[PDB]
Amino acid sequence: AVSEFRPGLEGVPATLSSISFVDGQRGVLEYRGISIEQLAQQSSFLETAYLLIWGHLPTQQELTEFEHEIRYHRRIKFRIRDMMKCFPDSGHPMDALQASAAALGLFYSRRALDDPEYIRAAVVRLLAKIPTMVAAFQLIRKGNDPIQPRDELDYAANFLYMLTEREPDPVAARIFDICLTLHAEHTINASTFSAMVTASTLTDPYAVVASAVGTLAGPLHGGANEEVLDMLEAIGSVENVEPYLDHCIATKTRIMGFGHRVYKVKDPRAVILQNLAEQLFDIFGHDPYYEIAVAVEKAAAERLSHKNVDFYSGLVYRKLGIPSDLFTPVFAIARVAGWLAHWKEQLNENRIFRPTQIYTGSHNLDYTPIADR
Amino acid sequence: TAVSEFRPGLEGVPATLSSISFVDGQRGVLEYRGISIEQLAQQSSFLETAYLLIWGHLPTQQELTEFEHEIRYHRRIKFRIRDMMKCFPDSGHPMDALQASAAALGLFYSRRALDDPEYIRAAVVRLLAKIPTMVAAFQLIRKGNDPIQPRDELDYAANFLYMLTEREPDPVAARIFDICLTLHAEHTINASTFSAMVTASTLTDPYAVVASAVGTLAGPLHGGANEEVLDMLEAIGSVENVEPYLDHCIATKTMGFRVYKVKDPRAVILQNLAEQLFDIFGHDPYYEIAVAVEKAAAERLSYPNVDFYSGLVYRKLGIPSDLFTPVFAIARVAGWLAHWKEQLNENRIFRPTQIYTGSHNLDYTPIADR
Amino acid sequence: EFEHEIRYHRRIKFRIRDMMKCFPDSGHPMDALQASAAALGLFYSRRALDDPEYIRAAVVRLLAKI
Amino acid sequence: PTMVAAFQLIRKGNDPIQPRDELDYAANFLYMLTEREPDPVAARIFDICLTLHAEHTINASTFSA
Ligand SMILES: [Mg+2]
Ligand SMILES: [Mg+2]
Ligand SMILES: [Mg+2]
Ligand SMILES: [Mg+2]
């Protein structure tokens, strides 16, 4: 119970960082000092990733070259596909991603360290291939051949095309990218911290993404996006939205929907997502569940007056046709940009992260020959 | 308000309250659940030490026998896991392969999401039993050789050596390997253990936690050791060159691989183990070179003498240099599994804060402007 | 003689097992048996009832391998 | 020629590059190794190089054949 000890390293700074700023008291989230809202209105995930990773907005020549490098590296090796084919059909998709990222290491890990070329090659490879790999498990698990990357399509569209084999409406592709930019970086989140610890050892970059995938996968930091859709299924009609919440008002000690709420209130990402969803639904029509969600928001206002961005995200994904099991994985595709950016920073000044413990245990015990205890 | 303090690397910063391990340093003391490493090494199996760390009580015979039986049944690995390893590149780094293999193990298992105590025991048995088998498989598969099947008669250390070399180990060597495995099992909040704690705090599958930890141990700064030590011994090339070689390094260009200002208790046990193995199974030119380096080093050092020996013992046992970090993983899985259970009881998520050196309130700049 | 013949033919060829490995994990077992039985035909389909032996061989192989 | 290029891709884990009908013999081989169509003058130089090594009278390799 020492004052020095804080459970969960809460309020304890782990690094000095310039990549992102979040205030709980006030809505603001900034990437390299730029408001998320401005970037969302006028940015690409790839441009935002460059800003986060290299700290400067890209020149047109720089951006176009960066996109070209990703397009050439989008495809994945046959050996990687065969391994996924070896994967269990009912295997969890996030566990599959961790294995897939590590495997990429067996090939591209041979590395030049202290070489600037190395940081960019890994960033281009990881950003380009993690989306291709996620789509391939979805197709392979069903016995379906993986849909190859199409050079003509942009990063957001290719991911959607690889999952469905149907080119996305251009407007739909834009919303997905904005969603990707929204989930790219959120300060010292648990997934980023794991990546930073893996990085501290000076391990290869592909391993750091793999360690982060494992942490994102777990439910508390893990996407809880799937839960919102299931509850929405639980209320069959817009009618009964009011009844369902009240029975839930008695509750079994549970928090979801960004319940951890490191921001105390109003994550701004959520506000942008809700607008994005409404625009998408109006163009592409309104699903019955979506109306149920809108109703849930109206009930929330009585809850809102005193004191679910993930909840908004899942709905958007479904309209775009993303499978729910792939939702935590889509977050991984965006967070790779944040993860890579933290990796470069840890490298510039690196001390291995070795913490200390408070011992609550015994001392000076003597070994006992087995005797019944 | 008040001065704000930042320790780089969370150094000296407590992250958890644990009964699993104590290292004094200075006094040179390592204790697992209150028992000296020296006593455990002399009188305990890696598996017995593993029960003590994971469950916190030294086990009873009916418990040790059951635990050993459960490990033997789960020692074998699925064809799908072996086929996936065949897909792996031959030249691929062995530690990256361990990370992928453990993560894959989750796909078959992990269909529990269970608060059942059975779920924790099930993972402990599978992870401890399978990780040694998988490491052996990559070494054989990389050379195009079929993986050697586990032998029920053989114990855990012997089975690993048999799978790696295809030849039954001498009993004395197997005991030395088990003691080495017991020695590297737990060392408080290592970077690898901390990664396991942070992965486990999210409530992710245990197999994933091991995978994230294996990536952390893989890095050269922590858990990457050896190979370089032998690398140097091959380089000196003679007892005669040792006095000159050490001086050249001391004079300029720095030695490879300190946790504490006192000698690691583990190095003390390892050197005696090394001496016994070399005398019993034959000294090698490399061993003699090592002996010379240590005597020479002590007069200049009087020393990073810690855990260099492990490579020497492993080489004598015939473990390849590439697999040395992986051998450590087999032993430290027990500590990682133990921490996973302890983290689970309170399970606060790890969300540390940051100090912002960055700009604020900037505005997007159009690309055409540049 | 019958029991011994059944014991000898109990083992199944690697190519069929590889075929089962190609089969979906969630696939229904009875549908899987139908594919497996039909496959045994590709390896073993030869001869005529005129051979009394052919009837005996099928009886032993099918009883042993199914 | 297709086989030699195919090993080069397989060894590095890359899928083999299939022959393109439009390309001539020298160009397909270069395309198969690189995946980029060769400049024509270079394709001509490679074709001449192949002609130079095609026959050298009775030599260990021909004698074995
Ligand atoms: Mg973009
Ligand atoms: Mg923060
Ligand atoms: Mg700009
Ligand atoms: Mg000739």
Author numbering:
A (entry chain F): 3 to 309, 314 to 379
B (entry chain D): 2 to 255, 258 to 260, 263 to 307, 312 to 379
C (entry chain C): 67 to 132
D (entry chain B): 133 to 197
From the paper:
This rigid-body rotation is well known from other CS enzymes. It takes place following substrate binding and pushes CS from an open conformation (which corresponds to the conformation in the Δ2–6 SeCS structure) into a closed form in which catalysis takes place. The rotation into the closed form is in the opposite direction to the clockwise rotation that dimers undergo to associate into the fractal. This result implies that fractal complexes have to perform a significantly larger conformational movement to induce substrate binding or catalysis, which probably imposes a higher energetic barrier that could explain the decrease in enzyme activity.
CS catalyses the condensation of acetyl-CoA and oxaloacetate to citrate as the first step in the tricarboxylic acid cycle. Using cryo-electron microscopy, we reveal how the fractal assembles from a hexameric building block.
